[PDB]
Amino acid sequence: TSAMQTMLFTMLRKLDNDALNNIINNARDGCVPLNIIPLMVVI
Amino acid sequence: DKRAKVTSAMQTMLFTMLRKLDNDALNNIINNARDGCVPLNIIPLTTAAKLMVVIPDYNTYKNTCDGTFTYASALWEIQQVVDADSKIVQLSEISMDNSPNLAWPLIVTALRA
Amino acid sequence: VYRAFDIYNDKVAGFAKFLKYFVVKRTFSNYQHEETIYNLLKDCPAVAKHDFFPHISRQRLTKYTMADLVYALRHFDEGNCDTLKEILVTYNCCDDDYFNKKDWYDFVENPDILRVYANLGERVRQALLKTVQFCDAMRNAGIVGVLTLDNQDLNGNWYDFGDFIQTTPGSGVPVVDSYYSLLMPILTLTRALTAESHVDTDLTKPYIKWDLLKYDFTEERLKLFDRYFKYWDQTYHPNCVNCLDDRCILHCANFNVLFSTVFPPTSFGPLVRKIFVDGVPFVVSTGYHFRELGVVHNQDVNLHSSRLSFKELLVYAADPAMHAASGNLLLDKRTTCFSVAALTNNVAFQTVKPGNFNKDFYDFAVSKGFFKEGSSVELKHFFFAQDGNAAISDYDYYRYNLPTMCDIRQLLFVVEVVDKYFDCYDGGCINANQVIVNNLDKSAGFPFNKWGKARLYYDSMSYEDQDALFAYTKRNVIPTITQMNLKYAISAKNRARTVAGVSICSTMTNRQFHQKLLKSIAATRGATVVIGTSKFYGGWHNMLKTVYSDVENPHLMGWDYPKCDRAMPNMLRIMASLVLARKHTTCCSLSHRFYRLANECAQVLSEMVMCGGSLYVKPGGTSSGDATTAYANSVFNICQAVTANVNALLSTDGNKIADKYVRNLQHRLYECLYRNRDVDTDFVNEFYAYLRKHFSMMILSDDAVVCFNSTYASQGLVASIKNFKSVLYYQNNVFMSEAKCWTETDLTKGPHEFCSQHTMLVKQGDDYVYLPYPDPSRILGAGCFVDDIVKTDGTLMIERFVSLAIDAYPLTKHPNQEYADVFHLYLQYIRKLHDELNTSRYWEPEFYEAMYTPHTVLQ
Amino acid sequence: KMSDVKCTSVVLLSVLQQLRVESSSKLWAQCVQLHNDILLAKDTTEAFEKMVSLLSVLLSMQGAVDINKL
């Protein structure tokens, strides 16, 4: 069941958008948010 | 075989429904009819001893389940409020400001008084 | 100016618009005649004042008569409906700016119009009372004549006494068939009998505190009848058990529907009693109070029993009495539907998962040049996920089912024409050892789905038990329960899709009732109803050339039924069930057929539905889980089409019909609708043949294509799409938008859309044949997304893709290259999938070609 | 870039539901609304912003699938 997230991130890197890649790069090293992003970040 | 199984299951369900119905209210309602034959929609209405109000928004909580409430020409008092996730929401939690913080709808369970 | 008239004389007949306060009018003999008749009917308070000076001057009348109102509400057209707006505005039912809102006329969108129309009801009922008063005068003064709606103004008064004749006192007789029959559809629309819910029939006083234990109301029904329908010259049974024929059943149910909207809704539903089973008091249903059929008391009511049989156990488990009584009281504030009882301690919530995206086929398609920005074929069909409060938001849609009263004289002839439409199939009551069981894994309804599927109950009940249960149903009522659930399905819209599991105790007997008829309708080719006729092997081409058969100036037309399964009135569903049961003239007596009708009306019309975790009351509509809904919908469709044709043939000015046969047909149609109560089989056959000639329908469940003589419908001799709009507005309480109704003038371009498919003529085998092709984006959606069942075995995925390729083959003849690319892509993909694992090899194109030619007609 | 973001949203809500997000009624309703709004999106930047919003509730949630290793 762990391969579902791997293929999801494969598709995400296939998209290659500025916002999505920025958010994933941030969350890579723990700098994640806490609430849903509106249309609460830590560290 | 499985016919015996479904007979036993139906019997068990019928008995678990049967041993939670009879009381003074049920007979006091049935024995005032023409030949002891009342509609069905009024046995849980004026004989039951517990009401479950499904409140979707805070306004329908104000006008319906204010902190006693009268339904079916009787007296109930709001109690044991429960949100969509089955978490005991204390009556203090259900306010105007703090309403978006708890997952609607709420389920109020009130005893008959 | 144009005013609606109800006319019947030696040269014209119908209810149509013809060109003609203190109205003034103009024969010496007619002058004296009207003067004498008025003088004899002068003292009645329902007559308007008349001034005989040479002219006949009437005084203090409205601008529109009740005929104008009945027409505007029965021939509605949002483009030209200024008279309805003027009527609504003038009597303070709404304001002028109300008609600046969008979709105000619509019932689904903006249901507040049901509050504006209702603001006429009291006025309406006032007129009704006046009517009775008027007739009293004519019964006490010796006056014989017919009552026309175009004589009673909107304030109730009457005038125009020219048709009447002087006779012996105390014996004058009014005839009120046309009047009441044309007023009937708008009695419930405006809620005319609301003031009967109050204490002394006054809208300024509290509602009657009706005794909760009271359920019969028969005396009050007869009182209301005698009060408003005093001169209706036909025996009215408040309980439809006493009728003599299914026409009597329809006739009396059409009145009980109107009279049941003044009583407390807690008095309907099953009537229950406390019986003693082996000493212990059970609560079981010993009757049922239908809003349509009155009070029905079961005949085999056994008390003080020693033990129960398996059949009795099924009747008791399905008996909601033990469930609604022994549960908890439920006040459900999420919906306005009547809520009965919560059987659990906490409301349950149900969700729907997203689709299971197949990435392999998608990458394959992108490698095959598809999904380019700017392509004509897209991905538009997804599995939408649903949150918790979805199912109930589905159930609340039943707020679109309203009480609807019908034109009883019109319906009593439309039912004959519809029975003629079905007069070629076999039917009757079959035994238990002849029922052919489809999908032995269907849900068995609540509370039966707690222990197994329908297969379980079918294998536990011997044939004798099923026969005994059928006989029981033919003498008693079993108000079973259904269970609603959310459905996992593909759609281009995110709306919630639901399936209703009807209990096994209802389907087990509905099958023994309707199996022969359904099989005979499914095994016939070339009729008006096409159900069970595969589009394969020329079937589409044959069906199209059957619809094309002999229409003179052929045009094609189609329509939709907005909120069909939710808003279909109960009167029309009872009519459909009676049309279907009309085959039982050698296997059932009249009482048997009425008990079957009552069983069905209790089980599939106004049953108790367990949604979420509780039991509510279903106000009406069809249950998609019934085997007989696909055919009852076809009966409803044929009824609506025949009704549109009747209202098109009548509402046209018979003085401009340059034909003589058509004008005589219209005259005879009026004679057979509101006169000659006995059915005229000769004219019924004449009208059926006329329709077959000039209006040829192809109808599957609530889906229809029509080939019609365009020159006639150009003049009004045949139903048009605006006629279907009007009929659906006044009979189905739903608005039909012409943005979803298609008309096609060229017959080479076949039906624009029938059964969610398209048609095009192609040259195949040196012969031009009509082939159906589907929307390509839907097939791409069904290929890219699956429902998470084929992920464990490749065989089912291969079979789904082969079915999609089969469905996709005809696009190879489409002129758009990208459309044939779809089938070629499917074929490449299935060749791949077969490599992973001559006319029977599913991996070559000649296995699919042979599916669409009648020269290889096997399965 | 329209079909790709749509199937990405499909698999993203698949993962979200797989992580028992459906046990929070409010958060699951938010995720369902965003998914259904992406599946009806007829423009690419709105689909992308709804997609990053829907990914937020995946990478803001901790105890979920790891991301530093992928």
Residue numbers in the entry:
A (entry chain D): 84 to 122, 129 to 132
B (entry chain B): 78 to 144, 146 to 191
C (entry chain A): 31 to 50, 69 to 74, 76 to 102, 112 to 895, 911 to 932
D (entry chain C): 2 to 71
Give passages from the manuscript:
A key component, the RNA-dependent RNA polymerase [(RdRp), also known as nsp12], catalyzes the synthesis of viral RNA and thus plays a central role in the replication and transcription cycle of COVID-19 virus, possibly with the assistance of nsp7 and nsp8 as cofactors. Therefore, nsp12 is considered a primary target for nucleotide analog antiviral inhibitors such as remdesivir, which shows potential for the treatment of COVID-19 viral infections. The structure of the COVID-19 virus nsp12 contains a right-hand RdRp domain (residues S367 to F920) and a nidovirus-specific N-terminal extension domain (residues D60 to R249) that adopts a nidovirus RdRp-associated nucleotidyltransferase (NiRAN) architecture. The polymerase domain and NiRAN domain are connected by an interface domain (residues A250 to R365).
We have also observed C301 to C306 and C487 to C645 form disulfide bonds in the absence of DTT. After the collection and processing of 7994 micrograph movies, we obtained a 2.9-Å resolution three-dimensional reconstruction of an nsp12 monomer in complex with one nsp7-nsp8 pair and an nsp8 monomer, as was previously observed for SARS-CoV. The cryo-EM map allowed us to build the complete structure of COVID-19 virus nsp12, including all residues except S1 to D3 and G897 to D910. These constitute a structural block with five antiparallel β strands and two helices. Therefore, we identify residues A4 to T28 and Y69 to R249 as the complete coronaviral NiRAN domain. The catalytic metal ions, which are observed in several structures of viral polymerases that synthesize RNA, are not observed in this work in the absence of primer-template RNA and nucleoside triphosphates (NTPs).
